[PDB]
Design a binder for this molecule. Sequence first.
Ligand SMILES: *[P@@](=O)(CCCC)OC[C@@H](COC(=O)NCCCC)OC(=O)NCCCC
Length: 196
Amino acid sequence: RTTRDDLINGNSASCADVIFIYARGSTETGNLGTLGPSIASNLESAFGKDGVWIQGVGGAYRATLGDNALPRGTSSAAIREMLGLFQQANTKCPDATLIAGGYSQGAALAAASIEDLDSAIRDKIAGTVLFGYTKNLQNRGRIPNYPADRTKVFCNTGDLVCTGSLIVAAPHLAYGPDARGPAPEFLIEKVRAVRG
Ligand SMILES: *[P@@](=O)(CCCC)OC[C@@H](COC(=O)NCCCC)OC(=O)NCCCC
C-alpha cells in the first residue's frame, strides 16, 4: 500500500537489519506514492517482512507542486523531516544498514537531506536510487558529499526534468518498470556488499 511507517512504529527491541527511507513525487498519495510500493515489495522478498523496515517521508513533507521552484528543489521543512527520519533510525537501531530513494521532488529531497546528514550517519546509507531526478543536470547526476558508486539515477530520454526543465512529459511517468526490477536490485546488491 501507499503508506508505510515501519520505523516510527517499530520496536527498538526488535530492529530490522535494513531500513529503507523513501520520498514520493509531487502530488503522490500516502507516503510512498506510485513507485515506493513496488520497491518495497521487492525488498521484502529479498530480506523478509522482518528483515527490512519500509518508511515513507510523511510529516512536514507535503509534496507541493510549488516547492519544486525553491532553491533546493523542495522545502526546508521537508528536508528537516527526512533528516529526522535518518537520525531516528540511527538512534533506535544503531546496527541497521540504511538505503534510500526518491522520485521527482522526492529525489531532490533525498539528495538535499543526504547532503546535510552527519557523515557518521551518512556512511550508513549503503545505496540511494533516484527517479526523474529534478536536479540531475544541475548536480551533474550526483548527490553532494555522497559516493557515486552508492548512487543510481533513472532518467528517461525525453524526461525534461532530468535535462534542467520542470515540464512533465510522457517519459517522466514511465519509471514503473525500473522501480520493479533494476532499482531494487541495485539496493539489494549494495546492502549485501556493505554487510561483509
Ligand atoms: P515531480 O515531483 C516534479 C513536478 C514538476 C513540477 O513530479 C512527479 C509527477 C507524478 O506524476 C503523476 O503521478 N501523474 C499522475 C497522472 C495524472 C493524470 O508529478 C506531476 O506531474 N504532478 C501533477 C499532478 C497531476 C496533474
